Amino acid sequence: GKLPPGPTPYCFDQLRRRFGDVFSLQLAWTPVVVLNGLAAVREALVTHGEDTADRPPVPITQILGFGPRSQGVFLARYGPAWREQRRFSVSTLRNLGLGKKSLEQWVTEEAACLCAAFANHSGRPFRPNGLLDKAVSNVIASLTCGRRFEYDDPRFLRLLDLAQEGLKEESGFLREVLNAVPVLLHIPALAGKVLRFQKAFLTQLDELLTEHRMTWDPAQPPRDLTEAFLAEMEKAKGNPESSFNDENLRIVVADLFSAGMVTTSTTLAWGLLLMILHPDVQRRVQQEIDDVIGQVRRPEMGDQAHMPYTTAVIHEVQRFGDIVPLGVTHMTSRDIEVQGFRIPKGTTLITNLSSVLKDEAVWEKPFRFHPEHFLDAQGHFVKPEAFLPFSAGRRACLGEPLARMELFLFFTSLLQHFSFSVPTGQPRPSHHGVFAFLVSPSPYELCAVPR
Ligand code: HEM
Ligand SMILES: C[C@@H]1C[C@@](C)(c2cc(CNC3(C(F)(F)F)CC3)c(F)cc2F)N=C(N)S1
Numbered sequence: 001g002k003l004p005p006g007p008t009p010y011c012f013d014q015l016r017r018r019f020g021d022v023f024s025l026q027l028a029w030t031p032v033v034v035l036n037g038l039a040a041v042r043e044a045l046v047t048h049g050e051d052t053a054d055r056p057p058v059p060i061t062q063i064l065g066f067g068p069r070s071q072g073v074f075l076a077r078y079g080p081a082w083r084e085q086r087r088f089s090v091s092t093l094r095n096l097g098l099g100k101k102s103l104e105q106w107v108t109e110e111a112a113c114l115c116a117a118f119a120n121h122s123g124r125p126f127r128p129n130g131l132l133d134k135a136v137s138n139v140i141a142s143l144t145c146g147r148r149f150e151y152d153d154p155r156f157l158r159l160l161d162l163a164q165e166g167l168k169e170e171s172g173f174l175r176e177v178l179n180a181v182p183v184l185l186h187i188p189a190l191a192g193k194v195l196r197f198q199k200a201f202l203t204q205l206d207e208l209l210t211e212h213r214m215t216w217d218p219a220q221p222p223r224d225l226t227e228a229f230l231a232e233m234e235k236a237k238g239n240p241e242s243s244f245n246d247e248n249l250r251i252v253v254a255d256l257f258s259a260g261m262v263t264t265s266t267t268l269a270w271g272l273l274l275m276i277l278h279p280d281v282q283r284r285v286q287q288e289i290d291d292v293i294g295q296v297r298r299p300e301m302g303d304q305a306h307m308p309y310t311t312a313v314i315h316e317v318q319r320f321g322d323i324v325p326l327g328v329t330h331m332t333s334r335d336i337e338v339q340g341f342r343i344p345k346g347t348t349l350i351t352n353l354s355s356v357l358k359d360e361a362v363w364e365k366p367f368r369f370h371p372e373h374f375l376d377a378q379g380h381f382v383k384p385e386a387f388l389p390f391s392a393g394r395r396a397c398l399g400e401p402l403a404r405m406e407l408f409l410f411f412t413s414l415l416q417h418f419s420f421s422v423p424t425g426q427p428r429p430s431h432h433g434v435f436a437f438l439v440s441p442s443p444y445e446l447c448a449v450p451r
């Protein structure tokens with residue numbers, strides 16, 4: 001077949017309008033094919049999902065204790081080691097969610113802590129990012145370790161700080177070079193420099209896991225994902241094929257922790273920024289909150305079905321926010337065909353999710369914050385096919401149900417008790433974000449006055 005034509009997200013918008021939705025690039029040793037628009041993305045992740053659910057090899061993960069039966073979930077290669085952890089994490093989230101609503105309970109209570117932390121900043125401008133990280137991180141810790149940490153807890157702060165630094169290391173030029181040739185890691189001085197912040201994050205997490213293993217009561221049903229993991233580890237003793245082992249427990253937990261902490265928080269950070277840039281939208285949400293919930297009762301997930309406008313605003317925050325523009329890289333495990341063109345096995349796939357969320361042929365005004373993107377004339381919530389912030393296919397975000405819950409409950413609770421605005425005397429904050437593998441809003445302050 002014909003190979004795709006050939007010559008950051010702004011650079012891909014030029015290449016798309018010069019070579020089409022499926023073009024190619026040659027980044028050093030790696031052959032890369034970029035996918036643009038819903039059609040091209042769907043064709044790879046859904047139609048040929050069986051052949052595009054693999055990850056590109058990351059040899060430097062061996063420093064972090066990555067093995068064949070211990071690859072975590074996020075970077076895990078397509079196969080049994082991934083499928084077992086994928087199916088486990090998805091099912092455990094569901095099981096902890098249903099029954100007694102443990103998920104909803106921990107989030108609701110964490111929201112109240114977030115509202116209280118905001119209240120102590122009242123009558124004074126501040127950056128909401130730090131508090132959002134802690135509140136979002138605690139929800140994860142409630143699912144993994146079955147606990148939360150105080151906002152001034154020393155180890156908690158260090159855990160969050162190391163996690164934020166570990167994200168920057170992922171986007172380092174030193175990475176790709178060492179990732180290409182693994183024998184460079186044999187250098188003792190060089191090996192410690194590669195992922196010093198990430199390995200620090202692991203070490204700090206180990207200390208917390210060890211403590212948790214002490215308090216775990218096997219005689220009772222697992223309170224959290226780690227306890228559920230530990231319970232499987234005992235059953236998998238004497239089985240070298242199982243991905244349930246000590247080396248993988250610290251990696252899977254680190255995956256779930258890091259993933260749903262920098263994403264959900266950044267989204268909420270975008271959310272509050274769009275609420276002070278567009279106060280009219282904020283008022284309509286707060287009005288719908290009063291008409292459906294009130295101003296004293298805590299928001300519930302059962303309220304979402306009766307709050308179409310708020311649902312549209314949150315969805316539009318994700319769409320406009322566009323926090324993961326280029327998604328997470330895939331890799332072809334076979335030879336496939338995308339939009340007529342041929343894609344060789346082992347080709348690194350890039351899913352330009354930004355081109356889907358900002359598709360001008362789909363959305364009425366893609367480059368604007370327009371809540372009506374998810375509303376019809378009547379006021380009903382509609383969700384277009386092109387809403388893919390969690391990507392699609394087998395590798396689609398397993399944290400989406402939790403994210404949906406965290407976003408609705410945190411966003412509604414904050415607007416229920418606070419009115420957000422720009423601090424007078426300060427410039428109107430740009431709605432353009434600082435580009436990375438994860439797009440955060442441009443640094444801003446806000447005033448949160450109670451109601
Ligand atoms: C606003 C919040 C979030 C967004 C926008 C988001 C987005 C994404 C994206 C784009 C991917 C890549 C999908 C692909 O490779 O095709 C992904 C994967 C993943 N996410 Fe999220 N995510 C969010 C929250 C979460 C949460 C809350 C968790 C866990 C509790 C989580 C855990 C994961 C994991 C483990 C993967 C890898 C799944 C796999 O490789 O099969 N994320 N997410
Ligand atoms: C969801 C995560 C996204 C980032 C960017 C990522 C990775 C780490 C470090 N990950 C570990 C390990 F799992 F590999 F062991 C050192 C503790 C972060 F601390 C933060 C991140 F965003 N990279 C990943 N490979 S998974």
Ligand SMILES: [Zn+2]
Binds near residue numbers: 144146212216223226
């Ligand atoms: Zn526990």
Ligand SMILES: [Zn+2]
Binds near residue numbers: 378380
């Ligand atoms: Zn309708």
